[PDB]
Ligand binder design. Sequence first.
Ligand SMILES: O=C(CC1CC1)Nc1nnc(OC2CCN(c3nnc(NC(=O)CC4CC4)s3)CC2)s1
Ligand SMILES: O=C(CC1CC1)Nc1nnc(OC2CCN(c3nnc(NC(=O)CC4CC4)s3)CC2)s1
Lengths: 410, 409, 410, 410
Amino acid sequence: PSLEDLLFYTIAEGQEKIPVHKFITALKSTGLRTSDPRLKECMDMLRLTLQTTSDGVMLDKDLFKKCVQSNIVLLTQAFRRKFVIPDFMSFTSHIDELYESAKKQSGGKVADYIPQLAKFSPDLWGVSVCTADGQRHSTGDTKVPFCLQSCVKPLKYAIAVNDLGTEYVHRYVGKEPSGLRFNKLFLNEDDKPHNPMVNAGAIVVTSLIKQGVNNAEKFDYVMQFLNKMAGNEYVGFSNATFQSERESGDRNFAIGYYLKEKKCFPEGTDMVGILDFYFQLCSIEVTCESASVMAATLANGGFCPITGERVLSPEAVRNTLSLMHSCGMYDFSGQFAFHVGLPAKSGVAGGILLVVPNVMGMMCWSPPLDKMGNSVKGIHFCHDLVSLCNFHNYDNLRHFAKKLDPRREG
Amino acid sequence: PSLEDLLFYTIAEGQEKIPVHKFITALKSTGLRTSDPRLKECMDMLRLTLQTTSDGVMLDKDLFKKCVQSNIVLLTQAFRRKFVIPDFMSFTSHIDELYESAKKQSGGKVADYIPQLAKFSPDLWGVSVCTADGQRHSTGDTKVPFCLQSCVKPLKYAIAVNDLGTEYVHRYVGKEPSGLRFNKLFLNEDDKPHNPMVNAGAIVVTSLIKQGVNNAEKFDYVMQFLNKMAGNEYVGFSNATFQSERESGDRNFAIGYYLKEKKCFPEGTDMVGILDFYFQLCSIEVTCESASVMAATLANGGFCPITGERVLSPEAVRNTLSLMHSCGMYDFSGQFAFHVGLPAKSGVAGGILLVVPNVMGMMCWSPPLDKMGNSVKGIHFCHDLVSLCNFHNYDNLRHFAKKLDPRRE
Amino acid sequence: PSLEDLLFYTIAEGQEKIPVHKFITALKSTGLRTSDPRLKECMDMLRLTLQTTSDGVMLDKDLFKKCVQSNIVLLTQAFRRKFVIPDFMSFTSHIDELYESAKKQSGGKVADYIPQLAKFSPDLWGVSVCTADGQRHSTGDTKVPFCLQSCVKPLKYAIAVNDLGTEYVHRYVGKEPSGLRFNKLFLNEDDKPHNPMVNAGAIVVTSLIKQGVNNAEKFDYVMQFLNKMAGNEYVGFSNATFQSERESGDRNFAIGYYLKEKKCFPEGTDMVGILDFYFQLCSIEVTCESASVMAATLANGGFCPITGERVLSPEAVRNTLSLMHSCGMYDFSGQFAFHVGLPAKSGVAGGILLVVPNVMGMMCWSPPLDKMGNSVKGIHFCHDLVSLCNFHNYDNLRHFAKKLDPRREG
Amino acid sequence: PSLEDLLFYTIAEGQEKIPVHKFITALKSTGLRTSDPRLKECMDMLRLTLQTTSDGVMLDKDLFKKCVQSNIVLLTQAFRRKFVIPDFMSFTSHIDELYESAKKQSGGKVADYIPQLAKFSPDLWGVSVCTADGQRHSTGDTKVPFCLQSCVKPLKYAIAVNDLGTEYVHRYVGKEPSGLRFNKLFLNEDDKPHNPMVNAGAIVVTSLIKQGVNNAEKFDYVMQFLNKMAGNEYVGFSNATFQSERESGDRNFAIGYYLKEKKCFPEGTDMVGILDFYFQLCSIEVTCESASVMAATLANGGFCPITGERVLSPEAVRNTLSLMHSCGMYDFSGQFAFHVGLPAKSGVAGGILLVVPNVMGMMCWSPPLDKMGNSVKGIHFCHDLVSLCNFHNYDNLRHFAKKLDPRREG
Ligand SMILES: O=C(CC1CC1)Nc1nnc(OC2CCN(c3nnc(NC(=O)CC4CC4)s3)CC2)s1
Ligand SMILES: O=C(CC1CC1)Nc1nnc(OC2CCN(c3nnc(NC(=O)CC4CC4)s3)CC2)s1
């Protein structure tokens, strides 16, 4: 027996040679993209033979073997329906329907704080999916860049814990939700911020990352991190939104001084510089596609699913998912934890970073916010999603009424 | 082919016949108990053949099939190691280690506010396990009855939602945690109690179950329900602790009158009777074994794992696990959700009802409480549990460090 | 020289005999009423001589001497303008204009939570004055009975301190205002009610009065007290209001059980009987005239100005005035102390018991309440009052701009 | 008749000539000081004639009148025991006892957050009195300069209301005390600081004074203003304390940014300049004598009692006295109002500015503070003060137990 040849006959159809396009559409049907970094060696040798013998273009059994040799094990699971979502083609059409149901909920008002988010038009709406296995799909405005804003708070919290450990980080910031009556308080009762997802907590967390180095190298350190989470897809930076966040963070300056007075930063902290670093981190840009890979990195125990390098310790992604659960959506986190039951983080540019643990990561983006600060279309999508699939943290995997389970076949 | 006969040879070893003791010892190894309700027809026909002629306790291929015919699909799933924890005999050996390691944490104070918990000894400590498949194990004082107290709060919430639906119930009670600055408040901004796990909420939820019937029959109804959840294992009642809660619930009466004044009960409520009903509900008795089965009913989407009966609507069970997550351990719910990440509910008798969704249900019980109200041994156990296995709600099932996963071989 | 005799000539005006009616109106102009208990001896012998020498209504120098001999010292202070308000006749016309200006403020809603307060018409409006010297004036519906409701809280607090002293009472009850959103909280940090003027505080105080006796004599003990404070004018009791307040005091019972749980009562307290007693004290009736004298005993260091009876210790009256200043008018107490700056207590029947220390007491009554619980016309009257006179707690008695000073002459 | 020598024989003894020393000693007996500004012309005229004659240090009836002619009306009330305290010489002997009893209370901690208050000795302790009539007395370290710190809070609030009126000023700051459970919050429910006596309130009040001019002229405006209030006694400035207050007022900047974000300042405010000005205002220096005169301007309806100048509108003095009543002693304000019943304001240098309305003003100073921020010796002194005399705001002027009344003679 030989794994490359058994997969040959699977696609061969009892026939004698396989056209390459028939192989290519067979592959994309799995949800894989031909640009997948785990597939480069296979694709590089297909493009080569598609030069060496323009003659063709059909593959013997032993040239198919020459190309899939390198990435055979990943290819077999794709064609033997072993990915976490086996029928990826039907799942994506569900996403498409869920997308179009959100697309009609046209309320909310775009963030007006700076001329840079006000710049964004309300009809932009994109969702993109990345599974824990690398299967992708997008629909809508998924290649438009936008800033993470408070979508970055879980990403840097993971880095802090990854680099420093739970006990250190949570010596400086709590691990509970405020309570719907304390969106106004900076500190909890032990004089630490309530959790990493609130502005005072995010700021203290920023104060821990890569201490003793200057603000340029801290920034590069975090972005090399954010690149690994996204498999080197688009991670950018808008100086435009940074400058205006610099002139309008009166409240953040209020928090900054309060924290200095109550000695909540590590010793030797330059608080006014830390705020600048914090302002920068909120102006990091992503698209819906690149961020969906980040979310899937958290969904995948810290391994970036399209590259397979370990980016975060399991201790960091577990901690981050727990605090996204309960403190991820501003005042909506209680209701969101109840009705949707997914770790998510929302941001004021209209982004909602969504994680379905052990399944997939997502990014939804629509600039118009509701009155609690969350993307209107995004929130509508996430209710529609859990109402359709048994992804709620406390759905049952065995008995789930008329919910669909995409992890199953028939 | 013949699957009753296929299983005969699995246990028979290609040898003559199966001694019956060798069959049941194989059976207990799976984690099933011979008293399993789904096995009665098999056991009934074992009791029949053991009267045929008392020695030569051996089963041919056709008398073995004579007994296992009725329950063959469940028996093969056990013997083809298809249960949620395949190597169950090894998992229980870890339970034993976790239990006996927790046994050494002898700090805490027994609740003394009533003489009925004050008579309970601090050295009692029991742990019982029930999988989503009916595999059982216990260690310690697992057959001693004790009151649920506020471990009953999620159970009646489930009943309420099961019978009346999310939207009605949550017209009368919120669905978020108070906030560690609010175990002192009864009502949130909308003048409803914060969630079903706090006393004002539980009291309101109690006012929803089986309205229009009197308190005797409401109680009979809830007992019938808890019987379904526990597979007809021990559910009782101690009139003693009921009396003392009745003479000692000044705080409960304070809450009741606040709720009556701010009109949080359904119309036609006899508020002072509902308090009486509530006191009864907290004096319902369970053992660790019986209650662990109730926990497993929640772990299993509302189906009782030792009977197969559908006991709760999926909407009821999801909701309850959701609110056990964030509001289940008094002031410890935040720290508990973060470190343990399992839906749990604690009570002042020393109980902790624990759910590991899609795996198993649990009940731990040792009366000495910590200064937040949670059983000291219990809390130590659930930390040790999640630290050993990847049962944390936000562990990864694929990449989980040096944690052990009992669902795998 | 001669005590009665020059006082004869002061009123005689060089004449031989004084018409008796001319004596009576001269006396009434001082503000004294001829029914004053400190004047009974003089009046008894005035009508007696109007029988014994029934023909000829005039008094020589020695028959005037026959009648005023008993009350001469009080009589001279009245006629030598030595009373706290010398020109009482001009002060009253101001009261009347102030009354007529409030009579136009026709907004508000009458308390309807029980049918007995709903019984009262919105157009009733009464004001009565009693100085620290016994001068009286009324205008409007000043002889209509109504319940004190929370106007009784300062009065029973005084009895408690009078009988037990500051230090004991304030073991069980605070002495500060809540803070304008701690009105739903029953207890402060030390697990005592915030002050005696909140319902929880009043209830605890009720628990200290005459401990160890049954409710009938406790009630008679308190009422025996109030009669003295009012110089034995109308103090009554509405059984109707008592029944309906007990029927419907769910929140009060809520408070009662809460206080028992947090052990706020003295040992051996029967909590539900104390509640019954509290409801009774809230259904005690006064008219504007009878209560205005009670207010004056507080204005007068504890001496009832129309009888000379010492009714309350100076420690009791100081404490009670202190807490009416800051906590007496529900959520309006801060605004009321700022703008009016007088010790006052409001009640849900529409009464406002007002004290001008060292000057006078008043009670205003109009059933319509505003949305904080205070009589609309009542509150309007007290603003008008202090804008007119230097009665504000911190006006200056020497430099006071264009305010009028009734304690002074011309 | 001639009221110049009606007074001559009063001091003369039926005698001959009056020695000059006997006259001024008779004068200091009144409590007036020979340095009284209202006595300049008289003192200048004593200084002139005590040049002419080294022989005959004595005053005929015609040269006494030559000197006292101009200030005769003030001198007559002094010798005619018409001052607010007729027997001032005994009242100061009580002040001495009250001082010596406080001298024994050696607890507390000198404020150490800045080295400028930290080098102050713990045994410095001074008390100074100034009546509404200009009578003066001091005991202890009454000429040692120290900073007002938060004792300046009422003074600038007075200026603010004096220049713009109550209604404008209170658009930017409330008028009630927070409540002993909200000393941590910056803003009330209407998004204004709770009152002028808390740091958020003072900062906003600072933003209203003499708007539109630069900080140099703003400071000069307030400095003369305080000059008028103190009758031109010592008012200074410690640049040392100002410097240490700006490098360590982390909480103050936090407050400023919060107020800036929630738009609590009038439009056109340079928030960080207002903080600079505020720090300056807290580093104004006084002595006990000079500050007690400021207290006396507040006791006197806005007239400085040693110069006769009108410095504050009565509306300004009422308002400030009202808010010193309830918010003047930090978390001790409720207990202080209940037990002492006088408007006072404390500051962290150990000062307590105390007002007994219509009687006298005071400044007490001992740097050791208690655990709430008030001078230990200071607080002990004012308790002892009011238990001795009927100065409590709700004492009775007629029935006041065995308390002493310094306003009466026998
Ligand atoms: O909203 C309001 C109106 C509200 C309706 C009456 N006022 C506001 N004024 N300022 C605001 O901003 C923050 C600034 C930082 N700050 C703290 N946050 N956390 C703290 N510590 C604890 O709670 C520890 C417990 C005690 C042991 S103190 C105080 C408030 S809100
Ligand atoms: O209305 C609301 C809206 C708000 C948005 C959530 N919540 C409410 N929920 N229940 C209420 O009633 C009170 C009745 C008496 N009771 C207390 N009184 N005082 C207390 N605090 C202390 O004693 C100590 C602290 C230091 C002072 S707790 C408990 C609850 S209010």
